[PDB]
Amino acid sequence: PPNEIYATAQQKLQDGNWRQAITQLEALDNRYPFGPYSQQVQLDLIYAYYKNADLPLAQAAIDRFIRLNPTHPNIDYVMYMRGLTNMALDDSALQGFFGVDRSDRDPQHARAAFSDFSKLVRGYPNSQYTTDATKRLVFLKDRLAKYEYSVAEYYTERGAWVAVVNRVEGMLRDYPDTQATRDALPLMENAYRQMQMNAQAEKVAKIIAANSS
């Protein structure tokens, strides 16, 4: 019976493990993709996928759910879960692999996570997930600024001084408050000093002298 299947899915989800609960939730979803009583099963399936490392399946379930329900009372949880799946895709040290720092790696997932957490905080600031979303936005902004700093460090090592000043200018425009922009201000001063402009190097030295850390 479907009520028996939902109760065994909830007991396997709470007492057991998410792997044993995905198959039980999938048994409800296969009968009712567009069928009735399929909306709480989709939210249970989204949590079960996220906790099972099935991040593309969790994102596909979230996309199905936000198309089937454009407005719902728990839409804040769905918006938090998209940024949370993208944050778990960044840090792709998952499934048996790890990396020492992953700031250098593709920031596309981190940008999607930052966009979803911001859209949640400016849409629903009264949710229980607002403080965690704001902390994840601070960490994601530090990760994006560290990526643009790693790109500025490479171009400094290669000798691409116009690329280095254009990168540090992009970092000052987009991430003025991050530690990586302070780390990058020396690179912008060095890149101007390697060129025939010392007035810009004096301006960057004045910015560093005013406050850098």
Partner: peptide, 17 residues
């Protein structure tokens, strides 16, 4: 210009390196 002054005064730097 690829390189510009982003600090106060609008100044364009045409560097050719």
């Amino acid at each position: 210009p690829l390189m510009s002054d982003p600090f106060g005064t609008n100044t364009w730097f045409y560097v050719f390196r």
